Design a protein around this ligand. Structure first.
Ligand code: MG
Ligand code: MG
Ligand code: MG
Ligand code: MG
Ligand code: MG
Ligand code: MG
Ligand code: MG
Ligand code: MG
Ligand code: MG
Ligand code: MG
Ligand code: MG
Ligand code: MG
Ligand code: MG
Ligand code: MG
Ligand code: MG
Ligand code: ZN
Lengths: 155, 118, 59, 38
RNA sequence: AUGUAUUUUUAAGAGAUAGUCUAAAAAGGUACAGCUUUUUAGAAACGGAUACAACCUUGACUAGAGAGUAAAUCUUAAUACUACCAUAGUAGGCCUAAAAGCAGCCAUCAAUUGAGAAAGCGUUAAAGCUCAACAAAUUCACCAACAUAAUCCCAAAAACUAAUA
RNA sequence: GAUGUUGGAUCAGGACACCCAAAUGGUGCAGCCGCUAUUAAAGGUUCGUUUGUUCAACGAUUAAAGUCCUACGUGAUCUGAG
């Protein structure tokens, strides 16, 4: 097997660590990040949330506009549950494909209940004499996001 | 002319390795079909549109369940190129009353009776 | 407009102005093959002589 | 010369050569056998 | 039987009755039409076939700064012919101006170790050139292809970091 | 609820299936003429008698007096013999 431009597969060789060393290394790394959470060294967190059929990027003091009516009194404090991502300058927690409740918590307040600005929808047809004009008004809900807290427990 | 055609019986006589290939059990045939509609009924002759209205296959990519009796099998045969057929499996057995609220149908073609405990 | 931001030079001669403001070197898309004389004697000696030539044949 | 669809050697002395990405029939004995494929 | 919810009657009503192409069976014509004439199917997307009425994917609402998929992006190719050598009855009969293998009929014989009573050209007929036969060797093949139009070519490019994307 | 239709005049754009000029193969090519085939479109491609005529005949010449297409080019430029 001499070297010809073909006989050698065109890509870098794959170096894959042993599962044992990886289990140790993981236990250790998770341990360390865990020490950062316990310490309180995370400056500001941002989260990726799944709400009302969309995904969002959320941080404390921020604002989002949800496209349908929720049944909540105005000013109540909601706790969002399905959480995809959590991240901070030094570290990031990734859910498969969801983050466990005990690990992280994100609490928002509903600010505004509104009807959306009129959306003009009109179908038309060439010389069939067909027009249909309809104006749409959509109930909307604005959320202030208050807090993202992250608990020490990670194993 | 164009016609309703026919399928000769040889088509439907399975070889021994087709059992191994599709994972059907050679000894016992299976009870229920899960039939999904993959393709459109447009551009197709009216009698096929009929068959698809009878099978309850009205809108695409929704599963349906049917018996494996010869009567239903005939119609399926007529439309067999528009549909997807898979045997329904019941690992946990038949659903009883208490489990009616907890039923779920997985893409294996597999019915799960107890779904999402607490 | 973007056509204006492209600068083409026939050889390698470029005004000090354009040389001085260059950030980054792009990788060559095609891998240029070597000639015969390029190969280190190590590499040529290292490659198998595939067939056995007869002596009485003139080359 | 002749422009032809199919070249065929007319005698024993026609040799068949490819030049300029065409097929020619050249003949030294008689010139009238010269042909050129199109 | 079976899978479904449709069908028949009764009472009122109109429009419509100047169709196109695609697949299939046929007619007529030129086994010609974006041709005409019937019978059975399909179609008339805001997505593909760049552009597009008929082909293909899909059937349908109203919002979303979400997702999974469908038809589909345009690739396919095509080559050579080589040695060395050549006497014999006998220009076999028959014809024919001549007829000598080689104008046609008959015969296909027999020397040499090996050479057809001859497959080519050639000559008025001869004469003369090569093929088949040994002798010397080496062997690898054979089934070959096809000019052009009128304003100005018609994405640009590209052998390759892994795709049931 | 109009895309005004033959031939000329003027001005020509293009094709190459070259009539001339330019390089060449083959010849039943000695040379002179020729007859065929290949490659080449920058430039040329006449004046008259008779017909409304394109076509055609005929006189005289030219290196030649090409074959075509462009709404049988071109009438809000011209001419109407037809
Ligand atoms: Mg009509
Ligand atoms: Mg009528
Ligand atoms: Mg056509
Ligand atoms: Mg019909
Ligand atoms: Mg389109
Ligand atoms: Mg829908
Ligand atoms: Mg002799
Ligand atoms: Mg003998
Ligand atoms: Mg008008
Ligand atoms: Mg001109
Ligand atoms: Mg030419
Ligand atoms: Mg010209
Ligand atoms: Mg005209
Ligand atoms: Mg005129
Ligand atoms: Mg005009
Ligand atoms: Zn020859």
């Amino acid at each position: 097997v001499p070297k010809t431009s073909l006989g050698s597969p065109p890509w870098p060789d794959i170096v894959l660590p042993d599962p044992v060393e990886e289990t140790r290394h993981h236990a250790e790394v998770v341990g360390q990040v865990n020490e950062l959470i316990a310490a309180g060294r995370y400056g500001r967190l941002f989260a990726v949330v799944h709400f009302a059929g969309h995904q969002w990027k959320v941080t404390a003091e921020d604002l989002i506009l949800i496209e349908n009516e929720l049944d909540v009194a105005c000013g109540e404090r909601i706790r969002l549950e399905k959480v995809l991502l959590v991240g901070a300058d030094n570290f990031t927690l990734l859910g498969k494909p969801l983050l466990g409740k005990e690990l992280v918590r994100v609490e928002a307040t509903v600010i505004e209940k509104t009807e959306s600005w009129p959306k003009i929808n009109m179908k038309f047809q060439k010389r069939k004499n067909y027009q249909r004009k309809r104006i749409t008004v959509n109930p909307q809900t604005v959320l202030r996001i208050n807090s993202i807290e992250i608990a020490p427990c990670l194993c | 002319k164009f016609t309703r055609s026919r399928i000769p019986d040889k088509v439907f006589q399975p070889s021994p390795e087709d059992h191994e290939k599709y994972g059907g059990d050679p000894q016992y045939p299976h009870k229920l079909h899960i039939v999904t509609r993959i393709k459109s009924t447009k551009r197709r002759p009216y009698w096929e549109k009929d068959i698809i209205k009878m099978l309850g296959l009205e809108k695409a990519h929704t599963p349906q369940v049917h018996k494996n009796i010869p009567s239903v099998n005939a119609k399926l045969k007529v439309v067999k190129h528009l549909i997807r057929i898979k045997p329904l499996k019941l690992p946990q057995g038949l659903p009883t009353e208490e489990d009616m609220a907890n039923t779920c149908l997985k893409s294996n073609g597999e019915l799960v009776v107890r779904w999402l405990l607490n | 407009t973007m056509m204006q931001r492209l600068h083409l030079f026939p050889d390698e001669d470029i005004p000090e102005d354009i040389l001085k403001n260059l950030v980054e070197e792009l990788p060559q898309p095609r891998k240029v093959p070597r000639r015969l004389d390029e190969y280190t004697q190590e590499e040529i000696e290292a490659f198998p002589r595939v067939w056995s030539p007869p002596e009485d044949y003139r080359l | 010369f002749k422009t032809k669809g199919v070249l065929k050697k007319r005698c024993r002395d026609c040799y068949l050569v490819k030049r300029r990405g065409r097929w020619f029939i050249y003949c030294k004995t008689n010139p009238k056998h010269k042909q050129r494929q199109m």
